[PDB]
Amino acid sequence: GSHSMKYFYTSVSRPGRGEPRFISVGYVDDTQFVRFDSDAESPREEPRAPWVEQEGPEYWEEATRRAKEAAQTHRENLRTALRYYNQSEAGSHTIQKMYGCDLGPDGRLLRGYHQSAYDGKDYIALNGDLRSWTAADMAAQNTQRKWEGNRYAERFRAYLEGECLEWLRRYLENGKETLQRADPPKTHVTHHPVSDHEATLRCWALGFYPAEITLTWQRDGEEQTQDTEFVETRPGGDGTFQKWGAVVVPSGEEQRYTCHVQHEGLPEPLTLRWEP
Amino acid sequence: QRTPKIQVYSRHPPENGKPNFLNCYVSGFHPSDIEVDLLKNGEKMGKVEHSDLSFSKDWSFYLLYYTEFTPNEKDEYACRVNHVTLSGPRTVKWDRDM
Amino acid sequence: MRHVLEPF
């Protein structure tokens, strides 16, 4: 149907403590599958998913190599960044980098991602045309020019149309049971009296995948935003996701409220009511 | 810099005497320099591990510190977080309703 | 599989 592969990179310089901390993760949709930590006792690409654990030594040697190379590239980017913004070597700085590809339903390249930020703020990002670069500020324009001069977008794109889709399809094929699934959320409504005149209605959706989902409250059939609280979708720790939405309701009007959940794991959108 | 969001909860609906997994999910924070502890009755928990550092669309980091626990009426669990954007450590108790 | 990153 719709799948994606992304890679995340975080490098943090630590003055007086040696080399910067480098942490990178690999995701297939909402499922992590690889890991590389520079501060691991033996830095190397590690399997974080049962289905990639079948890859031969080659995969891990190459993956580790590319990971370390990425780390070097990141330290390098840290220094160069210090130079662009004219910053001291005694201060800490963070470089973040996310890049991936989306596999269409026809086995083609649907869309690509390649964006990097410096100190929590946008630095430079590849446009949807997959040909031009957009810099967020003055210093990043140096990187934009340097990448325009060496045809970086061309190579990264050769990657998008090549190894990215290939290994993505492969991963999807090896982990069909857990990657090509659409586990619907186990939902239920709970009641929690705030006082004697008020009571909080909480809508629960648990153990669903992927993470994408929408919870909304309705009063008498009309959307409700007032006196409402929706928490950020959260992992269960076992590969699934959770989310709940609550609304403060006058005592005696609970039966006028309905919860609505949208998740691709459900044939149709669910309508929930308080069932004491 | 951004202030972290704290969500302490259980993997499965809590039931007294029934084995379960305590989770502390901290998100929307920057930089990624942070300390997280799972507490039982005010004291640090025995075996606490966390997931690999990652971030979302707005570049904010998100971590998950988890451990095995079995909830009951007497015991009180919580999550303590130390971050540069926080004046002192923030402690969020685990509510079986949240 | 990862992509060979390039410096700023």
mmCIF file of C-alpha atoms in Angstrom:
data_model
loop_
_atom_site.group_PDB
_atom_site.id
_atom_site.type_symbol
_atom_site.label_atom_id
_atom_site.label_comp_id
_atom_site.label_asym_id
_atom_site.label_seq_id
_atom_site.Cartn_x
_atom_site.Cartn_y
_atom_site.Cartn_z
ATOM 1 C CA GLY A 1 0.000 0.000 0.000
ATOM 2 C CA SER A 2 2.222 2.790 1.303
ATOM 3 C CA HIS A 3 5.684 2.335 2.807
ATOM 4 C CA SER A 4 8.704 4.461 3.697
ATOM 5 C CA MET A 5 12.321 4.162 4.822
ATOM 6 C CA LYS A 6 14.062 6.890 6.809
ATOM 7 C CA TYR A 7 17.429 7.443 8.474
ATOM 8 C CA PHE A 8 18.044 9.798 11.393
ATOM 9 C CA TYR A 9 21.374 11.219 12.563
ATOM 10 C CA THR A 10 22.278 13.232 15.653
ATOM 11 C CA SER A 11 25.765 14.527 16.437
ATOM 12 C CA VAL A 12 26.538 16.522 19.578
ATOM 13 C CA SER A 13 29.925 18.133 20.181
ATOM 14 C CA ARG A 14 31.155 17.964 23.774
ATOM 15 C CA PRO A 15 34.101 20.329 24.454
ATOM 16 C CA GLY A 16 36.691 18.902 26.839
ATOM 17 C CA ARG A 17 35.232 15.401 26.656
ATOM 18 C CA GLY A 18 36.607 14.312 23.285
ATOM 19 C CA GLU A 19 34.817 13.210 20.121
ATOM 20 C CA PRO A 20 31.156 14.220 19.564
ATOM 21 C CA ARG A 21 28.315 11.845 20.447
ATOM 22 C CA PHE A 22 26.951 10.237 17.281
ATOM 23 C CA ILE A 23 23.602 8.435 17.325
ATOM 24 C CA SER A 24 21.832 7.234 14.178
ATOM 25 C CA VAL A 25 18.657 5.191 13.718
ATOM 26 C CA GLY A 26 16.960 3.413 10.822
ATOM 27 C CA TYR A 27 13.199 3.233 10.355
ATOM 28 C CA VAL A 28 10.907 1.253 8.094
ATOM 29 C CA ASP A 29 7.644 3.170 8.426
ATOM 30 C CA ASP A 30 7.180 3.369 12.197
ATOM 31 C CA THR A 31 9.424 0.394 12.967
ATOM 32 C CA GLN A 32 13.072 0.904 13.917
ATOM 33 C CA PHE A 33 15.376 -1.862 12.671
ATOM 34 C CA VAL A 34 18.990 -0.684 13.020
ATOM 35 C CA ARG A 35 21.209 1.228 15.447
ATOM 36 C CA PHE A 36 24.616 2.894 15.664
ATOM 37 C CA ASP A 37 25.990 4.535 18.802
ATOM 38 C CA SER A 38 29.484 6.037 18.784
ATOM 39 C CA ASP A 39 29.583 5.587 22.560
ATOM 40 C CA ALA A 40 28.759 1.893 22.327
ATOM 41 C CA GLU A 41 31.448 -0.404 23.724
ATOM 42 C CA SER A 42 31.965 -1.599 20.148
ATOM 43 C CA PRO A 43 30.369 0.876 17.682
ATOM 44 C CA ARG A 44 28.625 -0.983 14.854
ATOM 45 C CA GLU A 45 25.318 -1.288 13.007
ATOM 46 C CA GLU A 46 23.093 -3.285 15.362
ATOM 47 C CA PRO A 47 19.817 -5.098 14.569
ATOM 48 C CA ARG A 48 16.809 -3.670 16.414
ATOM 49 C CA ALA A 49 14.233 -5.695 14.490
ATOM 50 C CA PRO A 50 13.878 -9.502 14.342
ATOM 51 C CA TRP A 51 13.452 -9.491 10.546
ATOM 52 C CA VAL A 52 16.757 -7.785 9.639
ATOM 53 C CA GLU A 53 18.677 -10.163 11.857
ATOM 54 C CA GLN A 54 18.928 -12.552 8.933
ATOM 55 C CA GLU A 55 21.244 -10.253 6.961
ATOM 56 C CA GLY A 56 24.688 -11.727 6.319
ATOM 57 C CA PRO A 57 28.046 -10.363 7.565
ATOM 58 C CA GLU A 58 28.389 -8.269 4.395
ATOM 59 C CA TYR A 59 25.338 -6.171 5.233
ATOM 60 C CA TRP A 60 26.683 -5.398 8.706
ATOM 61 C CA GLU A 61 30.229 -4.664 7.546
ATOM 62 C CA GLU A 62 29.013 -2.268 4.857
ATOM 63 C CA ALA A 63 26.353 -0.738 7.102
ATOM 64 C CA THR A 64 28.896 -0.200 9.878
ATOM 65 C CA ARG A 65 31.357 1.302 7.404
ATOM 66 C CA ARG A 66 28.793 3.773 6.066
ATOM 67 C CA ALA A 67 27.736 4.579 9.629
ATOM 68 C CA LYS A 68 31.263 5.444 10.766
ATOM 69 C CA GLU A 69 31.818 7.401 7.559
ATOM 70 C CA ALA A 70 28.645 9.316 8.406
ATOM 71 C CA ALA A 71 30.020 10.004 11.884
ATOM 72 C CA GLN A 72 33.240 11.420 10.434
ATOM 73 C CA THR A 73 31.168 13.497 8.020
ATOM 74 C CA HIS A 74 29.245 14.820 11.030
ATOM 75 C CA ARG A 75 32.280 15.827 13.093
ATOM 76 C CA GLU A 76 33.512 17.515 9.940
ATOM 77 C CA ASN A 77 30.166 19.290 9.585
ATOM 78 C CA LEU A 78 30.480 20.386 13.212
ATOM 79 C CA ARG A 79 33.847 22.075 12.649
ATOM 80 C CA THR A 80 32.771 23.616 9.342
ATOM 81 C CA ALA A 81 29.638 24.862 11.115
ATOM 82 C CA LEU A 82 31.759 26.413 13.854
ATOM 83 C CA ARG A 83 33.484 28.239 11.015
ATOM 84 C CA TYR A 84 30.330 29.346 9.175
ATOM 85 C CA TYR A 85 28.624 30.876 12.214
ATOM 86 C CA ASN A 86 31.964 31.997 13.664
ATOM 87 C CA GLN A 87 31.462 29.976 16.841
ATOM 88 C CA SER A 88 33.804 28.931 19.649
ATOM 89 C CA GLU A 89 35.134 25.405 20.121
ATOM 90 C CA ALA A 90 34.266 25.576 23.821
ATOM 91 C CA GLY A 91 30.528 25.493 23.152
ATOM 92 C CA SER A 92 28.316 22.502 22.397
ATOM 93 C CA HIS A 93 26.462 22.182 19.090
ATOM 94 C CA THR A 94 24.021 19.712 17.552
ATOM 95 C CA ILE A 95 23.674 18.520 13.960
ATOM 96 C CA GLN A 96 20.574 16.581 12.926
ATOM 97 C CA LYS A 97 19.935 14.834 9.614
ATOM 98 C CA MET A 98 16.948 12.906 8.256
ATOM 99 C CA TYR A 99 16.735 11.296 4.817
ATOM 100 C CA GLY A 100 14.527 8.643 3.241
ATOM 101 C CA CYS A 101 12.297 7.429 0.427
ATOM 102 C CA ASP A 102 8.642 6.494 -0.054
ATOM 103 C CA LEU A 103 7.706 3.403 -2.056
ATOM 104 C CA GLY A 104 4.610 3.899 -4.196
ATOM 105 C CA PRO A 105 1.899 1.248 -4.679
ATOM 106 C CA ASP A 106 3.321 0.616 -8.155
ATOM 107 C CA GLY A 107 6.882 -0.015 -6.987
ATOM 108 C CA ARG A 108 8.052 3.453 -7.998
ATOM 109 C CA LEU A 109 9.644 6.337 -6.101
ATOM 110 C CA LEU A 110 6.755 8.313 -4.620
ATOM 111 C CA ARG A 111 8.643 11.013 -2.715
ATOM 112 C CA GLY A 112 12.074 11.681 -1.222
ATOM 113 C CA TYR A 113 13.391 13.243 1.979
ATOM 114 C CA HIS A 114 16.727 14.905 2.731
ATOM 115 C CA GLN A 115 16.808 17.604 5.403
ATOM 116 C CA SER A 116 19.428 18.701 7.932
ATOM 117 C CA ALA A 117 19.233 21.088 10.886
ATOM 118 C CA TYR A 118 21.791 22.835 13.095
ATOM 119 C CA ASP A 119 21.120 23.542 16.780
ATOM 120 C CA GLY A 120 17.430 22.670 16.522
ATOM 121 C CA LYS A 121 16.809 25.020 13.603
ATOM 122 C CA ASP A 122 16.495 24.264 9.888
ATOM 123 C CA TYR A 123 19.828 24.329 8.071
ATOM 124 C CA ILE A 124 19.286 22.983 4.555
ATOM 125 C CA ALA A 125 16.631 20.842 2.875
ATOM 126 C CA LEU A 126 16.176 19.148 -0.500
ATOM 127 C CA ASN A 127 13.056 20.410 -2.273
ATOM 128 C CA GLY A 128 10.242 18.183 -3.518
ATOM 129 C CA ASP A 129 11.657 18.465 -7.030
ATOM 130 C CA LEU A 130 14.623 16.445 -5.757
ATOM 131 C CA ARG A 131 16.918 18.730 -7.760
ATOM 132 C CA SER A 132 17.338 21.996 -5.853
ATOM 133 C CA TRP A 133 18.358 22.865 -2.294
ATOM 134 C CA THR A 134 16.785 25.344 0.119
ATOM 135 C CA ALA A 135 18.924 26.966 2.811
ATOM 136 C CA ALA A 136 17.307 28.364 5.955
ATOM 137 C CA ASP A 137 19.873 31.121 6.514
ATOM 138 C CA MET A 138 23.056 32.859 5.362
ATOM 139 C CA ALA A 139 25.599 30.266 6.504
ATOM 140 C CA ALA A 140 23.669 27.363 4.973
ATOM 141 C CA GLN A 141 23.840 28.987 1.536
ATOM 142 C CA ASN A 142 27.513 28.016 1.515
ATOM 143 C CA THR A 143 26.426 24.386 1.748
ATOM 144 C CA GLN A 144 23.768 25.011 -0.897
ATOM 145 C CA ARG A 145 26.351 26.377 -3.325
ATOM 146 C CA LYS A 146 28.866 23.637 -2.531
ATOM 147 C CA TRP A 147 26.207 20.990 -3.176
ATOM 148 C CA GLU A 148 25.059 22.684 -6.382
ATOM 149 C CA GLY A 149 28.650 22.734 -7.607
ATOM 150 C CA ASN A 150 29.287 19.032 -7.028
ATOM 151 C CA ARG A 151 25.866 17.721 -8.090
ATOM 152 C CA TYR A 152 25.021 16.159 -4.721
ATOM 153 C CA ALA A 153 21.285 15.992 -5.397
ATOM 154 C CA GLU A 154 22.138 13.852 -8.424
ATOM 155 C CA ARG A 155 23.979 11.208 -6.395
ATOM 156 C CA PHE A 156 21.560 11.200 -3.449
ATOM 157 C CA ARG A 157 18.846 10.749 -6.047
ATOM 158 C CA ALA A 158 20.706 7.880 -7.671
ATOM 159 C CA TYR A 159 20.500 6.472 -4.137
ATOM 160 C CA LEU A 160 16.770 7.171 -3.865
ATOM 161 C CA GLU A 161 15.993 5.355 -7.121
ATOM 162 C CA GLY A 162 18.462 2.585 -6.310
ATOM 163 C CA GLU A 163 19.535 1.049 -3.004
ATOM 164 C CA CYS A 164 16.754 2.853 -1.130
ATOM 165 C CA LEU A 165 13.772 1.298 -2.924
ATOM 166 C CA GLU A 166 15.621 -2.004 -3.367
ATOM 167 C CA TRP A 167 16.500 -2.532 0.290
ATOM 168 C CA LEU A 168 13.128 -1.074 1.280
ATOM 169 C CA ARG A 169 11.231 -3.659 -0.760
ATOM 170 C CA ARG A 170 13.581 -6.323 0.595
ATOM 171 C CA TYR A 171 12.943 -5.295 4.205
ATOM 172 C CA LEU A 172 9.195 -5.251 3.569
ATOM 173 C CA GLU A 173 9.437 -8.752 2.111
ATOM 174 C CA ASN A 174 11.464 -10.155 5.015
ATOM 175 C CA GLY A 175 9.178 -8.666 7.660
ATOM 176 C CA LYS A 176 5.776 -8.976 6.004
ATOM 177 C CA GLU A 177 4.158 -10.148 9.245
ATOM 178 C CA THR A 178 5.105 -7.013 11.184
ATOM 179 C CA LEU A 179 5.665 -4.390 8.476
ATOM 180 C CA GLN A 180 2.708 -5.035 6.170
ATOM 181 C CA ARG A 181 0.254 -5.243 9.069
ATOM 182 C CA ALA A 182 -2.604 -2.934 10.049
ATOM 183 C CA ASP A 183 -3.330 -3.730 13.696
ATOM 184 C CA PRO A 184 -6.516 -1.873 14.738
ATOM 185 C CA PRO A 185 -6.523 -0.093 18.132
ATOM 186 C CA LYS A 186 -8.175 -1.713 21.145
ATOM 187 C CA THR A 187 -10.435 1.135 22.243
ATOM 188 C CA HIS A 188 -12.517 1.854 25.342
ATOM 189 C CA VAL A 189 -14.083 4.764 27.228
ATOM 190 C CA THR A 190 -13.350 5.489 30.894
ATOM 191 C CA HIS A 191 -15.010 7.840 33.384
ATOM 192 C CA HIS A 192 -13.166 9.921 35.988
ATOM 193 C CA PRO A 193 -15.160 12.342 38.204
ATOM 194 C CA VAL A 194 -13.356 15.665 38.667
ATOM 195 C CA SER A 195 -15.745 16.755 41.408
ATOM 196 C CA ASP A 196 -19.473 16.505 42.151
ATOM 197 C CA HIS A 197 -20.628 18.474 39.113
ATOM 198 C CA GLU A 198 -17.972 17.480 36.580
ATOM 199 C CA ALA A 199 -16.438 14.294 35.186
ATOM 200 C CA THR A 200 -13.692 13.560 32.662
ATOM 201 C CA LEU A 201 -14.441 11.195 29.784
ATOM 202 C CA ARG A 202 -11.276 9.535 28.490
ATOM 203 C CA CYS A 203 -11.127 7.740 25.141
ATOM 204 C CA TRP A 204 -8.487 5.014 24.871
ATOM 205 C CA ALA A 205 -6.924 3.506 21.754
ATOM 206 C CA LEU A 206 -4.192 0.962 22.474
ATOM 207 C CA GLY A 207 -1.778 -1.368 20.691
ATOM 208 C CA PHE A 208 -2.294 0.009 17.191
ATOM 209 C CA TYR A 209 0.048 0.242 14.202
ATOM 210 C CA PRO A 210 1.093 2.290 12.431
ATOM 211 C CA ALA A 211 1.146 5.332 14.724
ATOM 212 C CA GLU A 212 -1.075 7.428 12.446
ATOM 213 C CA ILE A 213 -4.473 7.896 14.096
ATOM 214 C CA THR A 214 -7.057 10.574 14.906
ATOM 215 C CA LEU A 215 -9.182 10.906 18.047
ATOM 216 C CA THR A 216 -11.988 13.461 18.314
ATOM 217 C CA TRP A 217 -14.810 14.148 20.768
ATOM 218 C CA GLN A 218 -18.346 15.083 19.745
ATOM 219 C CA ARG A 219 -21.221 16.573 21.730
ATOM 220 C CA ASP A 220 -24.687 15.919 20.300
ATOM 221 C CA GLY A 221 -22.949 15.146 17.011
ATOM 222 C CA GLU A 222 -21.024 18.417 16.860
ATOM 223 C CA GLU A 223 -17.233 18.583 17.187
ATOM 224 C CA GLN A 224 -15.850 19.511 20.612
ATOM 225 C CA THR A 225 -12.619 21.420 21.227
ATOM 226 C CA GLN A 226 -13.526 23.215 24.454
ATOM 227 C CA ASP A 227 -12.413 21.530 27.685
ATOM 228 C CA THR A 228 -10.453 18.909 25.753
ATOM 229 C CA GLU A 229 -7.037 17.257 26.036
ATOM 230 C CA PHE A 230 -5.299 15.121 23.413
ATOM 231 C CA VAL A 231 -1.909 13.677 24.352
ATOM 232 C CA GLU A 232 0.859 12.936 21.851
ATOM 233 C CA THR A 233 0.848 9.434 20.370
ATOM 234 C CA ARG A 234 3.146 7.239 22.455
ATOM 235 C CA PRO A 235 4.935 3.879 22.039
ATOM 236 C CA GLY A 236 3.871 0.890 24.133
ATOM 237 C CA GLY A 237 7.414 -0.445 24.240
ATOM 238 C CA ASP A 238 6.569 -3.584 22.277
ATOM 239 C CA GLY A 239 6.347 -2.016 18.824
ATOM 240 C CA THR A 240 2.805 -0.667 19.048
ATOM 241 C CA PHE A 241 1.414 2.803 19.762
ATOM 242 C CA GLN A 242 -1.041 4.396 22.192
ATOM 243 C CA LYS A 243 -3.151 7.549 22.428
ATOM 244 C CA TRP A 244 -6.048 8.880 24.499
ATOM 245 C CA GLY A 245 -8.329 11.907 24.317
ATOM 246 C CA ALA A 246 -10.219 13.341 27.280
ATOM 247 C CA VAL A 247 -13.036 15.862 27.721
ATOM 248 C CA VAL A 248 -14.472 17.512 30.833
ATOM 249 C CA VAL A 249 -18.227 16.935 30.943
ATOM 250 C CA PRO A 250 -21.052 18.205 33.190
ATOM 251 C CA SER A 251 -22.432 15.403 35.371
ATOM 252 C CA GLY A 252 -25.527 13.900 33.761
ATOM 253 C CA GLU A 253 -24.616 14.669 30.157
ATOM 254 C CA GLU A 254 -22.080 11.884 29.601
ATOM 255 C CA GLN A 255 -24.418 10.015 27.245
ATOM 256 C CA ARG A 256 -24.419 13.003 24.887
ATOM 257 C CA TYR A 257 -20.711 12.620 24.118
ATOM 258 C CA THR A 258 -19.175 10.272 21.551
ATOM 259 C CA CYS A 259 -15.574 9.373 20.740
ATOM 260 C CA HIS A 260 -14.370 9.047 17.149
ATOM 261 C CA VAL A 261 -11.235 7.194 16.070
ATOM 262 C CA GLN A 262 -9.618 7.000 12.636
ATOM 263 C CA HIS A 263 -6.973 4.359 11.949
ATOM 264 C CA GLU A 264 -6.231 2.504 8.708
ATOM 265 C CA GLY A 265 -6.439 -0.734 10.688
ATOM 266 C CA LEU A 266 -10.189 -0.275 11.042
ATOM 267 C CA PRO A 267 -12.610 -1.042 8.177
ATOM 268 C CA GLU A 268 -14.626 2.025 9.182
ATOM 269 C CA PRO A 269 -14.289 4.915 11.665
ATOM 270 C CA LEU A 270 -15.418 3.858 15.146
ATOM 271 C CA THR A 271 -18.024 5.573 17.313
ATOM 272 C CA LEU A 272 -17.636 4.998 21.048
ATOM 273 C CA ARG A 273 -19.910 5.780 23.987
ATOM 274 C CA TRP A 274 -19.465 5.416 27.745
ATOM 275 C CA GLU A 275 -20.431 1.852 28.654
ATOM 276 C CA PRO A 276 -20.540 1.670 32.481
ATOM 277 C CA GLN B 1 16.119 25.055 23.552
ATOM 278 C CA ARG B 2 12.757 23.407 24.229
ATOM 279 C CA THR B 3 11.043 22.026 27.339
ATOM 280 C CA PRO B 4 10.441 18.237 27.350
ATOM 281 C CA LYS B 5 7.014 16.594 27.473
ATOM 282 C CA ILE B 6 6.563 13.817 30.031
ATOM 283 C CA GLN B 7 4.179 10.876 29.676
ATOM 284 C CA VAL B 8 4.453 8.124 32.278
ATOM 285 C CA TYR B 9 2.063 5.239 31.566
ATOM 286 C CA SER B 10 1.615 1.469 31.382
ATOM 287 C CA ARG B 11 1.920 -0.689 28.264
ATOM 288 C CA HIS B 12 -1.292 -2.556 29.065
ATOM 289 C CA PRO B 13 -4.307 -1.409 31.115
ATOM 290 C CA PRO B 14 -3.107 -1.603 34.755
ATOM 291 C CA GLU B 15 -4.434 -4.425 36.944
ATOM 292 C CA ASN B 16 -3.356 -5.002 40.546
ATOM 293 C CA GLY B 17 -1.098 -8.030 40.918
ATOM 294 C CA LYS B 18 -0.716 -8.458 37.172
ATOM 295 C CA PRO B 19 2.728 -8.171 35.505
ATOM 296 C CA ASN B 20 3.065 -5.073 33.316
ATOM 297 C CA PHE B 21 5.505 -2.641 31.691
ATOM 298 C CA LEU B 22 6.104 0.864 33.055
ATOM 299 C CA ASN B 23 6.992 3.464 30.428
ATOM 300 C CA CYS B 24 8.284 7.018 30.637
ATOM 301 C CA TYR B 25 8.085 8.803 27.319
ATOM 302 C CA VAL B 26 9.859 12.154 27.095
ATOM 303 C CA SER B 27 9.557 14.200 23.911
ATOM 304 C CA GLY B 28 9.669 17.663 22.352
ATOM 305 C CA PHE B 29 12.979 18.564 23.989
ATOM 306 C CA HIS B 30 16.237 20.097 22.763
ATOM 307 C CA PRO B 31 19.108 19.646 23.076
ATOM 308 C CA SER B 32 19.143 15.858 23.469
ATOM 309 C CA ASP B 33 21.125 16.185 26.697
ATOM 310 C CA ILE B 34 18.728 14.850 29.329
ATOM 311 C CA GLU B 35 18.460 12.566 32.358
ATOM 312 C CA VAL B 36 15.498 10.269 33.001
ATOM 313 C CA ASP B 37 14.784 8.040 35.998
ATOM 314 C CA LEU B 38 11.951 5.683 36.914
ATOM 315 C CA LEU B 39 11.062 5.870 40.601
ATOM 316 C CA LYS B 40 9.188 3.526 42.925
ATOM 317 C CA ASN B 41 8.173 5.187 46.195
ATOM 318 C CA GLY B 42 10.762 7.922 45.693
ATOM 319 C CA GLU B 43 13.724 5.631 45.056
ATOM 320 C CA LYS B 44 15.384 4.865 41.717
ATOM 321 C CA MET B 45 14.231 1.639 40.074
ATOM 322 C CA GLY B 46 16.408 -1.452 39.721
ATOM 323 C CA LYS B 47 16.620 -2.054 35.979
ATOM 324 C CA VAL B 48 15.854 0.948 33.766
ATOM 325 C CA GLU B 49 16.748 0.988 30.069
ATOM 326 C CA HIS B 50 15.927 3.391 27.235
ATOM 327 C CA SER B 51 15.434 3.370 23.464
ATOM 328 C CA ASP B 52 17.792 4.856 20.880
ATOM 329 C CA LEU B 53 17.783 8.646 20.581
ATOM 330 C CA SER B 54 15.580 9.919 17.755
ATOM 331 C CA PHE B 55 13.715 13.050 16.657
ATOM 332 C CA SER B 56 10.528 14.165 14.909
ATOM 333 C CA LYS B 57 9.634 16.683 12.200
ATOM 334 C CA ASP B 58 10.365 19.807 14.257
ATOM 335 C CA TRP B 59 13.758 18.345 15.202
ATOM 336 C CA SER B 60 12.657 17.778 18.803
ATOM 337 C CA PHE B 61 14.061 14.610 20.376
ATOM 338 C CA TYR B 62 12.038 11.779 21.905
ATOM 339 C CA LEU B 63 13.194 9.040 24.283
ATOM 340 C CA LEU B 64 11.519 6.113 26.043
ATOM 341 C CA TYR B 65 12.708 4.863 29.442
ATOM 342 C CA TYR B 66 11.034 1.582 30.357
ATOM 343 C CA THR B 67 11.088 -1.136 33.024
ATOM 344 C CA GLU B 68 9.070 -4.129 34.229
ATOM 345 C CA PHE B 69 6.603 -3.381 37.030
ATOM 346 C CA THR B 70 3.570 -4.853 38.792
ATOM 347 C CA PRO B 71 1.130 -2.156 40.002
ATOM 348 C CA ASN B 72 -0.894 -2.257 43.224
ATOM 349 C CA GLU B 73 -2.879 -0.078 45.635
ATOM 350 C CA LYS B 74 0.005 0.743 47.982
ATOM 351 C CA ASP B 75 3.012 1.384 45.728
ATOM 352 C CA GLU B 76 3.549 4.715 43.977
ATOM 353 C CA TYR B 77 5.478 4.968 40.706
ATOM 354 C CA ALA B 78 6.785 8.111 39.005
ATOM 355 C CA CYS B 79 9.217 9.556 36.462
ATOM 356 C CA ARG B 80 11.923 12.135 37.179
ATOM 357 C CA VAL B 81 13.459 14.246 34.413
ATOM 358 C CA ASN B 82 16.456 16.583 34.494
ATOM 359 C CA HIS B 83 17.055 18.990 31.613
ATOM 360 C CA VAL B 84 18.815 22.323 31.069
ATOM 361 C CA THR B 85 15.468 23.993 30.352
ATOM 362 C CA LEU B 86 14.132 22.797 33.709
ATOM 363 C CA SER B 87 14.594 24.618 37.011
ATOM 364 C CA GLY B 88 15.316 21.533 39.093
ATOM 365 C CA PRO B 89 14.141 17.976 38.349
ATOM 366 C CA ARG B 90 10.507 17.466 37.335
ATOM 367 C CA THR B 91 8.676 14.479 38.813
ATOM 368 C CA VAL B 92 5.467 13.174 37.248
ATOM 369 C CA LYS B 93 3.613 10.493 39.205
ATOM 370 C CA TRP B 94 2.057 7.559 37.358
ATOM 371 C CA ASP B 95 -1.732 7.845 37.232
ATOM 372 C CA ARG B 96 -3.589 4.652 36.315
ATOM 373 C CA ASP B 97 -6.200 6.922 34.724
ATOM 374 C CA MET B 98 -3.648 8.486 32.377
ATOM 375 C CA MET C 1 20.785 0.536 3.434
ATOM 376 C CA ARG C 2 22.249 3.936 4.319
ATOM 377 C CA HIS C 3 23.202 6.780 1.982
ATOM 378 C CA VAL C 4 26.784 8.027 1.748
ATOM 379 C CA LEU C 5 26.479 11.447 3.389
ATOM 380 C CA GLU C 6 28.543 14.428 2.246
ATOM 381 C CA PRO C 7 30.056 17.343 4.246
ATOM 382 C CA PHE C 8 28.635 20.877 4.529
#
